[PDB]
Design a protein around this ligand. Structure first.
Ligand SMILES: NC(=O)[C@H]1CCC(=O)N(Cc2cccc3[nH]ccc23)C1
Ligand SMILES: [Zn+2]
Length: 140
């Protein structure tokens, strides 16, 4: 689990969104595994606006923050899971590292702010859904 709180927005994995998130929906994309909902209180996270390929992510299944190098956001085939059939997921970045399903929502951060959240894993890889292209998260 995990979310990003920026301005009056909440960003979560689409597969973990609550009834309140869907009732207060701003934008969602199944192919990205992302959902953004509105909030009443202001958040404190800052979204990175950059092309960094190194950062640190939180892995709940190790209680550890790991420094990683990661690939640029791309269209990647993701095997079937409890929440989606086998499909291509867009805006996905991979790194060599540990990830289990309940690690989804863990933040990946660089020197500029939040880059994305854990979304995929297995086979010694970890995948992150990028949020740096969602520029509207910085306004209104
Ligand atoms: N974005 C997706 O398609 C998600 C949907 C929910 C989900 O359980 N997975 C599998 C997964 C995620 C993270 C870590 C993992 N380790 C092994 C499997 C695995 C994929
Ligand atoms: Zn950066």
């Amino acid at each position: 689990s995990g979310a990003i709180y920026v301005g009056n927005y909440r960003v979560v994995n689409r597969h973990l969104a609550t009834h309140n998130d869907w009732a207060n929906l701003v934008w969602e994309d199944s192919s990205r595994d992302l959902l953004v909902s509105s909030t009443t209180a202001q958040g404190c996270d800052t979204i990175a606006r950059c092309d960094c390929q190194t950062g640190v992510y939180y892995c709940s299944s190790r209680r550890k923050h790991y420094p990683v190098s990661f690939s640029k956001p791309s269209l990647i085939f993701v095997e079937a899971s409890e929440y989606y059939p086998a499909r291509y997921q867009s805006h996905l970045m991979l790194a060599v590292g540990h990830s289990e399903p309940g690690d989804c929502g863990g933040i990946l951060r660089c020197q500029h702010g939040v880059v994305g959240i854990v979304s995929t894993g297995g086979n010694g890889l970890v995948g992150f859904a990028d949020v740096r292209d969602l520029l509207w998260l910085d306004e209104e």
